[PDB]
Design an enzyme around this catalytic site. Structure first.
Site, PDB file in Angstrom:
ATOM      1  N   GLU A  46    -109.772  54.180  17.682  1.00 14.11           N
ATOM      2  CA  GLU A  46    -110.612  52.943  17.551  1.00 14.11           C
ATOM      3  C   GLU A  46    -109.778  51.712  17.809  1.00 14.11           C
ATOM      4  OE1 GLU A  46    -112.324  54.329  13.756  1.00 14.11           O
ATOM      5  OE2 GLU A  46    -114.307  54.782  14.918  1.00 14.11           O
ATOM      6  N   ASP A  80    -122.696  59.381  18.920  1.00 10.35           N
ATOM      7  CA  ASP A  80    -123.639  60.516  18.987  1.00 10.35           C
ATOM      8  C   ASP A  80    -124.888  60.210  18.231  1.00 10.35           C
ATOM      9  OD1 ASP A  80    -121.207  60.471  16.454  1.00 10.35           O
ATOM     10  OD2 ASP A  80    -123.005  61.430  15.895  1.00 10.35           O
TER      11      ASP A  80
HETATM   12  N1  LIG Z   1    -122.388  61.710  12.836  1.00  7.60           N
HETATM   13  C1  LIG Z   1    -121.522  60.978  12.306  1.00  7.60           C
HETATM   14  N2  LIG Z   1    -121.188  61.314  10.754  1.00  7.60           N
HETATM   15  C2  LIG Z   1    -120.108  60.514  10.427  1.00  7.60           C
HETATM   16  N3  LIG Z   1    -119.463  59.668  10.720  1.00  7.60           N
HETATM   17  C3  LIG Z   1    -119.407  59.355  11.963  1.00  7.60           C
HETATM   18  C4  LIG Z   1    -118.804  58.455  12.950  1.00  7.60           C
HETATM   19  C5  LIG Z   1    -117.625  57.569  12.879  1.00  7.60           C
HETATM   20  N4  LIG Z   1    -116.203  58.045  12.313  1.00  7.60           N
HETATM   21  C6  LIG Z   1    -115.904  59.181  13.339  1.00  7.60           C
HETATM   22  C7  LIG Z   1    -114.655  59.896  12.496  1.00  7.60           C
HETATM   23  C8  LIG Z   1    -114.992  61.433  12.589  1.00  7.60           C
HETATM   24  C9  LIG Z   1    -113.744  62.402  12.003  1.00  7.60           C
HETATM   25  S1  LIG Z   1    -113.671  63.620  12.676  1.00  7.60           S
HETATM   26  C10 LIG Z   1    -113.148  63.835  14.345  1.00  7.60           C
HETATM   27  C11 LIG Z   1    -111.675  64.091  14.436  1.00  7.60           C
HETATM   28  O1  LIG Z   1    -111.266  65.389  13.911  1.00  7.60           O
HETATM   29  C12 LIG Z   1    -110.328  65.845  14.811  1.00  7.60           C
HETATM   30  C13 LIG Z   1    -108.956  65.108  14.514  1.00  7.60           C
HETATM   31  O2  LIG Z   1    -107.953  65.968  13.937  1.00  7.60           O
HETATM   32  C14 LIG Z   1    -114.729  59.358  11.213  1.00  7.60           C
HETATM   33  O3  LIG Z   1    -113.807  58.213  10.999  1.00  7.60           O
HETATM   34  C15 LIG Z   1    -116.105  58.835  10.985  1.00  7.60           C
HETATM   35  C16 LIG Z   1    -119.279  58.796  14.266  1.00  7.60           C
HETATM   36  N5  LIG Z   1    -120.359  59.804  14.186  1.00  7.60           N
HETATM   37  C17 LIG Z   1    -120.474  60.080  12.964  1.00  7.60           C
END
Ligand SMILES: Nc1ncnc2c(CN3C[C@H](CCSCCOCCO)[C@@H](O)C3)c[nH]c12
Ligand SMILES: Nc1ncnc2c(CN3C[C@H](CCSCCOCCO)[C@@H](O)C3)c[nH]c12
Lengths: 230, 230
Positions: A13, A198
């Site tokens: 980000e 998403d």
């Molecule tokens: N549907 C949803 N529910 C909750 N939060 C969000 C967000 C926003 N951010 C993305 C990120 C996901 C961390 S896991 C992915 C990385 O893992 C793998 C890396 O090791 C965390 O900082 C929250 C986007 N869509 C979402």
């Protein structure tokens, strides 16, 4: 001199933030974060990613304020959409935020409520008004609404329905409410900006990985356009 | 010269701390908390209650470290028991702590895990050894175990059994993991002590209200005995 804190949750980000500002940054380690400190248009800008979730983001925001003396905090990143009119890549500014996973209902407290606080945490009206003004100039859509933050990645219809019914949230993420909360406790103006990655449903993980880069860049570009007006 | 931060979550948890130490305190407001600064046995003690939950406790612990320069952090308060051998008023020192409500399982992470962190957060071995030593000398039972922390007050058999099966936790509260986490990030020794107030079941609210004062005092008295040996 104006000092502005710029935060994301994941390194991905802030990658576009660092690139879009394009100035020389000094890297300063503190409390397990790296703060990138530069000057841009007469303003000191301090950029960091907190790492994921409420504890990480609370820590980093508190560090920004106490250690670097920022007078404003701007958060940029991605989020899950809870409303049909917020589609992939669309921008939202949070007017209020809630910690959706807080539950003290054993003592008849409403969900989201903690004693000596409130369910809804407010962001800066003057910064949100600025965001609205420049989005209109840019002819880009910018929605305003409630963002729900918790320590779960939401990927189910059932949980989406709860967030809408309980809090009338438009988007879900894992850091906005904690960032906004810290800023409220210290009297620091805060704006939380998110671009949709998403739909917080059963396909969310796949959508997130597909669109993280573009959505992060969209948010970052808009954040830069806000800093240009400060 | 030694500066020791002393934390509870609720005002009721620090009431017996302030009383038992007995000394004059200066009150210093910062970030929505009040820090009580005093001198005890030639050590400087900084006492505060964070307010409830993970965000509050993360904020306050970070302020303690950055603004007051504490070299150690000792947490004292109450907790719900998850195991038959931890009864009302019994003391527990947390050897590891977990954020039990963290769920990034959409990306195949185990529950409790956040990228760039770990499921289990360690506290100070040297401080836990001190606690054990004093407890043995005092002839008071002191259990060592895992504490689970989350932003819900637990009051159901189903959730209790999850905490035991998922994390092998012995007690549940809403702040320990975040305090221990912040201390880990800043390299500050941390000890988390809790006295049992309830059994984290359907009767927990009533048990909590009945035993909060006595259990808080029990924890505070033990915390003072630790400070007497630092
Ligand atoms: N549907 C949803 N529910 C909750 N939060 C969000 C967000 C926003 N951010 C993305 C990120 C996901 C961390 S896991 C992915 C990385 O893992 C793998 C890396 O090791 C965390 O900082 C929250 C986007 N869509 C979402
Ligand atoms: N079973 C259990 N589950 C989770 N945590 C605990 C804890 C530890 N503390 C008590 C307090 C919550 C009480 S809210 C009281 C209602 O608010 C009253 C003020 O308006 C919070 O700081 C956590 C004891 N038993 C527990």
């Amino acid at each position: 001199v104006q000092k502005i804190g710029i935060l994301g949750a994941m390194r991905e980000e802030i990658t576009p933030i660092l690139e879009l500002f394009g100035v020389d940054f000094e890297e300063i380690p503190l409390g397990g974060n790296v703060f990138h400190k530069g000057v841009y248009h007469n303003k000191e800008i301090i950029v960091a990613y907190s790492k994921i979730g409420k504890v990480h983001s609370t820590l980093t925001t508190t560090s920004m304020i106490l250690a670097f003396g920022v007078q404003k905090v701007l958060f940029s990143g991605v989020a899950g959409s809870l409303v049909k009119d917020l589609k992939i890549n669309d921008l939202l500014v949070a007017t209020q935020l809630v910690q959706h996973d807080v539950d003290l209902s054993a003592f008849d407290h409403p969900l989201g409520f903690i004693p000596e606080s409130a369910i809804f945490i407010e962001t800066s009206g003057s910064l949100n008004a600025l965001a609205k003004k420049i989005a209109n100039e840019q002819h880009i859509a910018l929605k305003e609404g409630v963002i729900a933050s918790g320590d779960q990645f939401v990927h189910s219809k059932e949980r989406k329905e709860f967030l809408v019914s309980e809090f009338k949230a438009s988007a879900v993420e894992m850091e906005g409410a904690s960032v906004a909360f810290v800023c409220q406790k210290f009297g620091v103006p805060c704006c939380v900006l998110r671009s949709i990655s998403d739909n917080a449903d059963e396909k969310a993980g796949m959508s997130f990985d597909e669109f993280l880069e573009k959505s992060a860049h969209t948010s970052a570009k808009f954040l830069k356009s806000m800093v240009d007006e400060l």
